[PDB]
Amino acid sequence: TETIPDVRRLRALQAEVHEELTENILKFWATRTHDPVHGGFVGRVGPDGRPHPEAPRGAILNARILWTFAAAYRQLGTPLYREMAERAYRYFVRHFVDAEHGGVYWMVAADGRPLDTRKHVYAQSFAIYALSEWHRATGGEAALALARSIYDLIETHCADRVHGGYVEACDRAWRPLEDARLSAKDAPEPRSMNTHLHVLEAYANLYRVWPETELAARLQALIELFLRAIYHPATGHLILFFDERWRPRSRAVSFGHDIEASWLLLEAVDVLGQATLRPRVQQASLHLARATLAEGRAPDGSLYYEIGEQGHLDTDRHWWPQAEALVGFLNAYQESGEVLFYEAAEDVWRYIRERQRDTRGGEWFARVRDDGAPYPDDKVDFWKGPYHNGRACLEAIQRLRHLLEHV
Ligand SMILES: O=C[C@H](O)[C@@H](O)[C@H](O[C@@H]1O[C@H](CO)[C@@H](O)[C@H](O)[C@H]1O)[C@H](O)CO
Ligand SMILES: [Cl-]
């Protein structure tokens, strides 16, 4: 009773995805973004494709570059990907890693000088995620050891052992900050789903290479936090911001976060080997997936951005929700066997190919308006790396590979 797309469609999609990753995404990053003046990678590329070697450089972006090239190398073996990953790692370790207090600085000047020394848990997570993947790809012990130390700092300095979860920002010396906002866009609240999602993601990847008992407990406690506090069963959306006791302090809905958490939650529970908890996760995850399917999609299959605090639907197509839906809908299909999820995956991909992709300038447009008009946003900046789209492509290729083997 398996309803599965025929081999031709499965393979056709997988080839376009592979082509997109290697010939557009990873090609753009390998050639436009390496910086030969300060080493490492540029912190910004404007809409016209101009790299900015003197732009300030965020840890998150640089961790994302590291993760993506490391992941691509592990799965595809292209020596250039290791080389690019190595370039990212060296700069990262030299300049972003705080050798005195531990963890990674928020932002450095292009030459490497600390510019914003705060220790944000979101950035610490991406560091762990990236270092753990580099370790997976190469077996480097320093990367793993650095990954472990950052974990230790988060638990030591940020863990709320009364209420679950984490204080999200500290100063350089690991003293809690009042303002935990990632940006001006975020609510001034003590807890955010966004930051806790990436702790989970980081910890799940670290657990792959360091299956330590206490990490397992921390990982499971985050999954449990998501099921009991962040995921809303009545709506099928993640609540975005909370106080310290996880009381909702927000009503906005973010479709891209929903669909990302949908597959991440499952990956995390399966990394953990937690069979007793898996049914509840699969249920929350399929719900997240359906809710996005029902409420977050334009008629062309692409995802809207969010519903704001006042209820306003932002219809802009940002690059990363499309990427995350690609994986989230393929995952929902693998989990439930319902082919409507496959069709949704195909719809979003066609949108990516037809609208999101910047064919002229390479890579993907950050934002596309509801009328199909691309905004003249930066191609690369603090918040736009190769991770969402690079990962989405790697995941889809591997997931399609498994489906193909149903024959
Ligand atoms: O997985 C989801 C991500 O964490 C998103 O939150 C990221 O989006 C960026 O979020 C920040 C903080 O809210 C915004 O200031 C920024 O404009 C968004 O692009 C996603 O990784 C994209 O960077
Ligand atoms: Cl990214």
Side-chain angles (χ1 to χ4, degrees):
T1 44
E2 174 173 23
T3 305
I4 181 162
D6 61 35
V7 167
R8 185 206 63 76
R9 296 172 62 220
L10 286 180
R11 188 114 54 209
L13 177 60
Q14 181 191 53
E16 295 196 8
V17 178
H18 180 266
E19 189 84 5
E20 179 65 24
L21 179 63
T22 57
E23 297 295 320
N24 182 23
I25 297 170
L26 297 180
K27 185 173 296 175
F28 177 93
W29 287 90
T31 72
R32 315 299 311 285
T33 73
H34 61 34
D35 171 35
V37 173
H38 300 291
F41 293 82
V42 301
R44 176 179 169 257
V45 178
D48 51 334
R50 52 172 182 167
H52 292 269
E54 306 294 329
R57 297 183 185 187
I60 294 157
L61 166 61
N62 279 265
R64 287 177 182 182
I65 296 166
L66 179 55
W67 182 89
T68 300
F69 280 120
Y73 175 67
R74 190 174 46 81
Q75 295 170 231
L76 302 189
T78 310
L80 166 71
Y81 303 159
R82 193 199 170 100
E83 175 181 334
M84 289 292 106
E86 183 89 37
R87 187 186 184 88
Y89 173 81
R90 288 178 164 281
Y91 190 100
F92 201 71
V93 161
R94 204 160 56 243
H95 304 298
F96 284 107
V97 175
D98 187 347
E100 285 57 60
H101 297 281
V104 297
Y105 296 118
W106 182 247
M107 173 108 79
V108 301
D111 63 2
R113 278 182 61 255
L115 219 66
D116 195 321
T117 58
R118 81 180 97 195
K119 295 296 162 53
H120 202 294
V121 169
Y122 186 103
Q124 310 310 306
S125 299
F126 265 93
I128 291 164
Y129 185 56
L131 296 167
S132 54
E133 190 71 16
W134 179 234
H135 175 76
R136 286 180 82 187
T138 67
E141 277 301 341
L144 179 51
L146 184 46
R148 285 186 279 109
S149 81
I150 292 162
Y151 160 74
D152 284 328
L153 292 159
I154 297 167
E155 297 298 333
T156 293
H157 299 287
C158 302
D160 189 330
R161 279 306 206 129
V162 187
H163 301 128
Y166 302 87
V167 167
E168 306 185 349
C170 297
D171 64 12
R172 180 195 221 132
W174 295 98
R175 305 168 292 189
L177 294 176
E178 49 156 338
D179 190 8
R181 289 180 288 176
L182 289 168
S183 64
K185 152 177 185 61
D186 310 286
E189 296 290 335
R191 306 286 184 272
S192 65
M193 167 277 299
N194 199 13
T195 296
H196 286 70
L197 187 69
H198 294 278
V199 178
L200 178 81
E201 165 192 74
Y203 281 12
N205 213 50
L206 184 64
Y207 193 81
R208 293 196 189 260
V209 296
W210 183 48
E212 204 246 354
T213 314
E214 168 74 331
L215 175 56
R218 303 313 279 144
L219 184 46
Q220 172 178 323
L222 265 159
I223 304 179
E224 269 162 352
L225 179 62
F226 261 91
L227 294 175
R228 76 175 183 81
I230 296 175
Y231 160 75
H232 201 183
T235 66
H237 298 301
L238 305 172
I239 293 166
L240 274 50
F241 298 95
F242 314 83
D243 61 24
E244 297 81 353
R245 302 220 25 188
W246 296 100
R247 301 167 182 118
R249 289 279 292 153
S250 176
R251 71 177 62 78
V253 173
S254 170
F255 310 107
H257 286 93
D258 290 344
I259 194 63
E260 177 181 358
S262 176
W263 71 271
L264 174 54
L265 281 171
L266 278 167
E267 183 191 355
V269 68
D270 291 343
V271 150
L272 194 58
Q274 176 51 270
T276 295
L277 189 65
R278 192 185 209 281
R280 303 210 311 282
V281 181
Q282 186 191 60
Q283 178 169 18
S285 149
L286 285 176
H287 188 190
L288 258 357
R290 295 189 202 283
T292 306
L293 212 290
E295 301 167 36
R297 297 159 83 214
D300 60 16
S302 61
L303 268 52
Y304 293 133
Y305 192 44
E306 66 159 16
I307 298 165
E309 296 296 334
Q310 294 331 119
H312 304 150
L313 176 70
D314 183 347
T315 56
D316 281 349
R317 272 66 140 184
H318 292 235
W319 85 103
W320 71 267
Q322 326 310 322
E324 292 299 329
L326 182 68
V327 190
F329 292 149
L330 276 180
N331 187 64
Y333 171 59
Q334 292 170 275
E335 284 296 318
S336 73
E338 293 174 49
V339 73
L340 64 95
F341 286 119
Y342 181 87
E343 298 260 341
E346 205 179 61
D347 290 338
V348 86
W349 175 255
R350 285 171 173 160
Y351 179 85
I352 285 157
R353 291 287 277 199
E354 287 150 23
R355 290 284 158 200
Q356 204 74 51
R357 188 159 64 116
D358 182 6
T359 306
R360 174 177 297 100
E363 234 268 356
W364 300 6
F365 291 118
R367 265 189 319 147
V368 179
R369 199 167 56 193
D370 182 68
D371 59 357
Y375 292 88
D377 292 346
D378 287 344
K379 263 299 170 44
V380 174
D381 61 12
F382 191 95
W383 286 111
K384 188 174 181 300
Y387 142 88
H388 285 292
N389 61 351
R391 177 172 66 176
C393 286
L394 292 161
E395 285 280 338
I397 294 163
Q398 288 305 324
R399 290 168 187 269
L400 289 161
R401 176 189 192 193
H402 295 141
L403 290 164
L404 250 346
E405 284 157 0
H406 289 196
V407 180

